[PDB]
């Protein structure tokens with residue numbers, strides 16, 4: 001079987017992407033943030049503290065004939081940005097673009113952090129990292145992808161994120177019409193539970209390519225590109241007036257500047273991120289200082305190939321017994 005669903009940016013900056021997901025019987029449609037950096041499917045629900053819900057669509061398990069409370073199961077998650085949520089667990093039917101999984105763990109949020117409440121367009125997250133990161137206790141639960149793997153025509157899903165435009169998540173097949181040239185596959189380490197790979201280097205604008213191993217994760221759930229300080233300093237050195245601001249919390253640049261492209265290596269192939277992709281607009285309404293889409297990972301402890309990088313490519317998440325990552329230009 002296969003599944004195909006359109007994913008849409010939540011705002012004019014591509015801060016996140018939401019994808020409609022059907023939960024329960026009859027279907028309750030929620031717009032979820034597909035996150036290859038985490039492994040929990042959790043949603044706003046009728047159980048969420050009422051003061052912490054502000055415009056989100058909620059899942060109501062009492063209205064689903066297939067919902068089963070997972071007795072004694074709880075969950076609690078903390079993301080690298082300081083966000084957090086927690087609650088209890090149900091099993092229910094979950095469908096993504098025609099692809100159906102029965103008995104999927106649906107984690108009902110009882111408490112969510114403020115940043116989730118303030119995001120009215122995101123009804124929850126759908127984790128697509130490896131199941132070893134799932135936070136359900138005392139019995140760990142499998143991701144949507146892991147549960148669907150056996151019935152998929154091919155044990156893969158692909159991410160085709162758009163720049164200020166809708167995109168597509170596909171399950172079970174590779175759309176050979178969606179990319180140009182060839183797909184370059186690179187090895188994945190699952191030892192931390194992430195889609196972790198090694199980039200072969202980078203280049204700034206039309207500059208010389210620098211062969212150097214950059215170990216990072218493919219994370220659709222992270223907005224920006226987080227790379228080592230040496231690389232990020234080399235990039236912003238090519239933007240007149242750019243500087244790292246402690247009060248803002250990253251590199252900023254004059255909004256009148258034109259940004260150079262950024263290239264990163266995948267084996268012998270190259271993925272070029274257009275400079276316009278790195279512009280994330282004024283730091284505040286009316287400001288002439290703009291926030292950069294490439295930031296340092298020094299404070300994070302791991303390099304993150306977020307949406308800024310991934311939306312420049314057609315990305316294959318190959319969940320075979322030996323998992324790999326595929327990158328193609330588009």
Ligand SMILES: NCc1ccc(C(F)(F)F)cc1
Nearest residue numbers: 037038079080219221222302
């Ligand atoms: N998108 C989920 C996510 C968020 C943060 C991290 C970090 F910070 F641990 F790298 C990994 C995955």
Ligand SMILES: NCc1ccc(C(F)(F)F)cc1
Nearest residue numbers: 035079083115116119221222
């Ligand atoms: N990396 C997972 C993640 C996704 C979205 C959010 C937000 F936008 F709701 F804060 C936080 C964390």
